[PDB]
């Protein structure tokens, strides 16, 4: 038993609980916007976002990086006008979960984020 899911044996766990998650994680790494902020340092992401915003104030810089503090979750930062904001994207066997929405494809998740970055953060 992994969480509420059932698995017949270890091969099922590795081939279905990890392999899709590894593929989903690999997709995020292969994304153009991906960056390595010393394993997911918030300060490094904040500095990079601020620098990018300074270079192109008109544009809204957003970056995706892996988080070492919370394995299986990716740190998605964006700086619309002022201080960059940070959120968490959890990798699940069904895809990517962000703001209570599951997107099998990374492209769909990014489109939703761009079109709904101004919405209030769930849970706050």
């Amino acid at each position: 038993w992994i969480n509420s899911e059932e698995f017949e044996d270890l091969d099922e766990i590795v081939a279905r609980y990890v392999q899709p998650m590894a593929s989903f994680a690999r997709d995020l790494l292969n994304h153009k916007y991906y960056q390595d902020c010393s394993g997911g340092d918030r300060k490094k992401l904040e500095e990079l976002l601020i620098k990018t915003k300074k270079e192109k104030p008109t544009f809204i810089p957003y970056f995706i990086c892996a988080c070492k503090e919370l394995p299986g979750k990716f740190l998605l930062g964006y700086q619309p006008r002022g201080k960059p904001r940070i959120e968490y994207v959890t990798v699940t066997p069904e895809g990517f979960r962000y703001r209570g929405q599951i997107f099998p494809t990374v492209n769909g998740l990014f489109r939703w984020f761009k079109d709904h970055y101004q919405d209030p953060v769930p849970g706050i």
Binding site: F7, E8, D9, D11, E12, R16
Partner: protein
């Protein structure tokens, strides 16, 4: 299936063969025809390692599947 001979997968790994998502099988079967004439027809066969990525018509076209034991493979 093509050559009707056994080769352990370990020997093929030593040979370093390249696994393909899709594979083809060319089996030569003699055709039952009137008058005793035989024509060595080579009917291709299609082998899929991952069956999830098949369209419903393709799923209908399926006719045989080898079971390795546990049922978790079939679920889905």
């Amino acid at each position: 299936l093509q050559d009707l001979k056994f080769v352990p997968s370990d020997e093929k790994k030593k040979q370093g063969c390249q696994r393909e998502n899709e594979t083809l099988i060319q089996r030569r079967k003699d055709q039952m025809q009137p008058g005793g004439t035989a024509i060595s027809v080579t009917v291709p066969y299609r082998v899929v390692d991952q069956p999830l990525k098949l369209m419903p018509q393709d799923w209908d076209r399926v006719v045989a599947v080898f079971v390795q034991g546990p049922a978790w493979q079939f679920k889905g």
